[PDB]
Structure 1
Amino acid sequence: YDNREIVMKYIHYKLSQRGYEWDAEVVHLTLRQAVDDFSRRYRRDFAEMSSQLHLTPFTARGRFATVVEELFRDGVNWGRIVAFFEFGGVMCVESVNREMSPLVDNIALWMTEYLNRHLHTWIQDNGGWDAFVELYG
């Protein structure tokens, strides 16, 4: 249902593993499992991109816009929405690692606005998140 709830719960889970208690049900567990399979799949290139990412408060919004525009340029699919969430999380984990944790709240806002403004039509026309729950899990 609520896109804002889905991003809050995904980010809270990734940060809690890092020992960072950020302050801010079937779908949440299905999304969390797909993104973990996505990390295992491209673990090689995930290490490279982590260092390649030069994240600061002055570049985050622009970095976010560029990568999201590249992901969905050739259309939307669930595999790209999964990569959308993993990029949202890698930037949150990276913010915490670099002692810029205030940016977590900005990244979650950018993810929520993009889901509601640019992914809402596609998802609903796919039947909503239950359609995602049927592919994964």
Structure 2
Amino acid sequence: YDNREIVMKYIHYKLSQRGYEWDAGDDVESEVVHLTLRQAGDDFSRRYRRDFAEMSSQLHLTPFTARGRFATVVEELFRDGVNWGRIVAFFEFGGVMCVESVNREMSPLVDNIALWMTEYLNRHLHTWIQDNGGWDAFVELYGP
């Protein structure tokens, strides 16, 4: 299980739900992890549909401030610590930011966001993940 593949494939899925293409992701084109994450993120987005509708209009993305927007949101999200729900929330947020970046003619940001997600995965969330039994724990809990 490779965190960059998990990130790439999740963003590819979010972009495809809006009919948007992505070059960095055709390249990479463990499957149970991606399915479970797809399903979990979709459910999270139905549960929080009205809040996501508001967050999409209030991201205020620009090429020079999107990094700080990402960091602000993600640090607030993990303020109480880490759990599976908040990791899915993190993926869904990154998905919404990539969608809005293409939607607002800032397509290049998608490659930056995949970086920051990957980075944040490996630096600040990977320990908790191993220590709670890895991604097969997640597939154990919410899989098909």
* Shorter-normalised TM range: over 0.9
**2-side partners of 1:89 and 1:60: how far apart?**
14
Worse-matched range after superposition: 93-102 or 14-23: 14-23
Q: CA deviation at 1:19?
A: 2.3
Kindly report which structure 2 residues correspond to 1:99-110, keeping only aligned pairs within 5 A, or say none.
Answer: 99-110=105-116
- What is the deviation of 1:118? 0.8
TM-score, normalisation: structure 1: 0.97
The alpha carbon displacement at 1:47 in A equals: 1.1
| Structure 1 position 36, deviation (Å) | 0.6
Q: Displacement of 1:33 after TM fit?
A: 0.3
1:74 aligns with 2:80: yes
Of residues 12-21 and 78-87 in structure 1, the stretch that sits farther from structure 2 once superposed is: 12-21
- State the shift of 1:48 in Å: 1.2
- Residue aligning to 1:6: 6
Q: Provide TM-score, normalisation by structure 2.
A: 0.92
Shift of 1:17: 2.4
The alpha carbon displacement at 1:119 in A equals 0.7
Q: Distance in 1 between matches of 2:114 and 2:64?
A: 17
d(CA) in 2 for partners of 1:100 and 1:69?
23
Q: Which moved more, 1:91-100 or 1:15-24?
A: 15-24
Task: Specify the SS of the correspondent of 2:69.
Answer: helix
Q: 2:23 aligns to what SS in structure 1?
A: coil
Q: Matched residues in 2 for 1:94 and 1:125: separation?
A: 33
Per-residue Cα deviation, 1:32-90 (whole angstroms, up to 9, x for no partner): 00011111101111111111120111111000001110011110000000000000000
Indicate the larger mover: 15-24 or 74-83: 15-24
Q: Which moved more, 1:97-106 or 1:15-24?
A: 15-24
- The alpha-carbon deviation at position 21 of structure 1 amounts to 1.8
Structure 1 gap ranges (5+):
none
Partner of 1:32: 38
CA distance in 1, matches of 2:17, 2:51: 21
Identity %: 99
